[PDB]
From a paper:
Mpro cleaves the viral polyprotein pp1ab at 11 distinct sites. Mpro possesses a chymotrypsin-like fold appended with a C-terminal helical domain and harbors a catalytic dyad comprised of Cys145 and His41 in its active site, which is formed by four major pockets that are labeled according to their position relative to the scissile bond of the substrate. The active site is located in a cleft between the two N-terminal domains of the three-domain structure of the monomer, whereas the C-terminal helical domain is involved in regulation and dimerization of the enzyme.
Pelitinib, ifenprodil, RS-102895, PD-168568, and tofogliflozin all exploit this site by inserting an aromatic moiety into this pocket.
Numbering used by the authors:
A (entry chain AA), B (entry chain AA): 1 to 306
Write the structure that this text describes.
Amino acid sequence: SGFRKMAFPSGKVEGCMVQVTCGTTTLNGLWLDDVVYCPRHVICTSEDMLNPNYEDLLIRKSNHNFLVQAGNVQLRVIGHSMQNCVLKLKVDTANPKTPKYKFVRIQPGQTFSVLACYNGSPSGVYQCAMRPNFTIKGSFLNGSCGSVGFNIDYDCVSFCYMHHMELPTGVHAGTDLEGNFYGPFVDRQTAQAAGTDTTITVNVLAWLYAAVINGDRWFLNRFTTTLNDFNLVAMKYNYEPLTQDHVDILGPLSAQTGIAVLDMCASLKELLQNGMNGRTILGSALLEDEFTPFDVVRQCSGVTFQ
Amino acid sequence: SGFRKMAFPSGKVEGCMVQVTCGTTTLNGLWLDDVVYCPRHVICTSEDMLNPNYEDLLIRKSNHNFLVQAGNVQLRVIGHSMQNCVLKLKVDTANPKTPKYKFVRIQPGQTFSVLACYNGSPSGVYQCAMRPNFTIKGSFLNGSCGSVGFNIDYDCVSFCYMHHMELPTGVHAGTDLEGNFYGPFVDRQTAQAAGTDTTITVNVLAWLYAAVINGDRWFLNRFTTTLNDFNLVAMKYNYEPLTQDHVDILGPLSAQTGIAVLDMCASLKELLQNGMNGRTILGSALLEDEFTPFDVVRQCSGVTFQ
Ligand SMILES: CCc1ccc(Cc2ccc3c(c2)[C@]2(OC3)O[C@H](CO)[C@@H](O)[C@H](O)[C@@H]2O)cc1
Ligand SMILES: CCc1ccc(Cc2ccc3c(c2)[C@]2(OC3)O[C@H](CO)[C@@H](O)[C@H](O)[C@@H]2O)cc1
Ligand SMILES: [Cl-]
Ligand SMILES: [Cl-]
């Protein structure tokens, strides 16, 4: 036992990272089959970003202007095109390391792993979640744009995110692999502010289920509640309303533990009202919301990937 | 910016994981060059573990009894030998994926990443630290024995840990790659209890330096202290005494931030005495001690690995 914020093994995605340089800008790209995906702002300069017209900035570029390096070998670019906020560079070699993969657009509250990269070289891996206000709370220095978020199922990598920018508040915005941003964010430097960072209540309960499975049970109480009562409390603490679909996704953890979902909501409610009183749950002194119900089951079941 | 508990990319180690079965027991092994390392308790049954005599249990084994599978291909075992608590199985093929690597025995307070594996297949990766009482607080289900902890420098993997067992308290014990356990723990089921889980003060300050670099500065105050005063406080809160070598390792973060190490200790001191008052630092409501000073510099500098 033990429960930890665990990322997916990163090897399969490490094999797709490449460096992309246009003019003076270098960032990362993702090499899948014979196509290299990267943020389109690689073609921008520093003022270019105040109010760029990418359609016009790309007119000045040709295939030979995009220097793509995979490890120490240069890749040949035979085509380029813009799709939403991403450029797709067609190279003349298929990546030999391409895993089986899919492109998916995730929902707020879902989690995924990030392989932070600089200059096409991996730096580290950590788990993140798509926040209800559509930002992620990552770790990104300059040059990390183009690093991707992903989940792995069996032997299929589902890419879900590509990094594009940092708000003045230090949180992060990006796109899916079709180039569409999560949320209202745009790839220009402007007054962009994030909405409320509401907590993903269904992940919190999942994590409370994890704790009981992993021996922490002090928060369990003699009470129960209803969805309509619970939700008055979640609305007061800036929590996502809990829904019947969520109660349903929590069924399996409820079955394995024998603790009814609504009794667990009653545990969460008292914790919101009274705090933890200086105690801890799974090593944390605050309620954790970046573990989905699939993530607790997966980690508590030892699911592996081939 | 942003600061997160980041693991090392796991691809290089994913290429060394293999399944090891002796009789009915399956666990993981590490395939480096032509040798496969795994816990010696793979040769034990269930009662065998109360007070095993591995010397005698191994006398009953031969090379053909150790079934080593790498992905879907079986490996041929041409030799086996015990070194402390690990068995070394010599196979007739060198692993083609062997990275450059080293075996190191770490010091308490040092951190490393774990690639949790089941049946020779990776499941996830997370960062851990060797605790002052020589246990690690991991995530391990049955079948995870043999998963390794590691750090990567440049393109050299320094293996530092191999998982072997769980104490009744849910914390974990293991060995280095030479087969010697960290701490007093032995590979038998007995009354083994962990000593105090003291906090690694030099990592805490490192993380306080990370927070200031990442915009959290509310804990900074108008005070300073001395090592001898500070240490009276660390001793009262079950913190490791801070030493001059530690002040020295913190120099670079002190230089980059302009906050004197002893002023930062004065910040840590008030936090120990008054608590955080319901606020948070780098997203945590408690003081984090599993980031070493090298880990903050590395993550805040974008160091990558080839
Ligand atoms: C085969 C051995 C094994 C596997 C997994 C676990 C841990 C575990 C954690 C979390 C969940 C579950 C199991 C699970 O879903 C939520 O529990 C449901 C009700 O018992 C069950 O119907 C599901 O098939 C599923 O096992 C223990 C032992
Ligand atoms: C080249 C661009 C760059 C690199 C790294 C960073 C972040 C950074 C974080 C943490 C530390 C340091 C830097 C560092 O050690 C601790 O700061 C010391 C005093 O300035 C310096 O002497 C060291 O070389 C080292 O830069 C910013 C910009
Ligand atoms: Cl916390
Ligand atoms: Cl974490």
